[PDB]
Symmetry: C2
């Protein structure tokens, strides 16, 4: 067992992901990058599904995967790039 | 299931292959940071698995998979 996949941690992870997704949508992305965003949104939706069915392990894996997708996009766009 | 030892071990092998193959192609400086981070998180997963922390190990490897898969999606062999 581990508190990393408890309900409140997953809820906060989701809130954090949704913030970064809005941040990435605030800038110009290539079509390929937009497809990464869409995949991250799909995995956000999956994380919520598993959380709601009480499967915290799968929920946690989905939101961390989505965070990896999104964090990579953030890293490819230095805030001082433009 | 997804975080059982057998599954994490397979994830770790699969990711090593994906990263060795990604780290030999033309990458931008920013992409190099992402690759480095994925390798670091793979290493973290390996460590936590050794200690029997399956949830922690699983989180590290799925995060690293997301980092890596994003780059794969930006480098389709046929871009179209």
């Amino acid at each position: 067992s581990n508190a990393l996949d408890c309900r409140e941690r997953i809820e906060k992870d989701l809130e954090d992901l949704e913030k970064e997704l809005m941040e990435m949508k605030s800038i110009k992305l290539s079509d390929d990058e937009e497809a990464v965003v869409e995949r991250a949104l799909n995995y956000r939706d999956d994380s919520v599904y598993y959380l709601e069915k009480g499967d915290h392990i799968t929920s946690f894996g989905c939101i961390t995967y989505a965070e990896g997708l999104t964090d990579s996009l953030r890293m490819l766009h230095r805030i001082i790039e433009g």
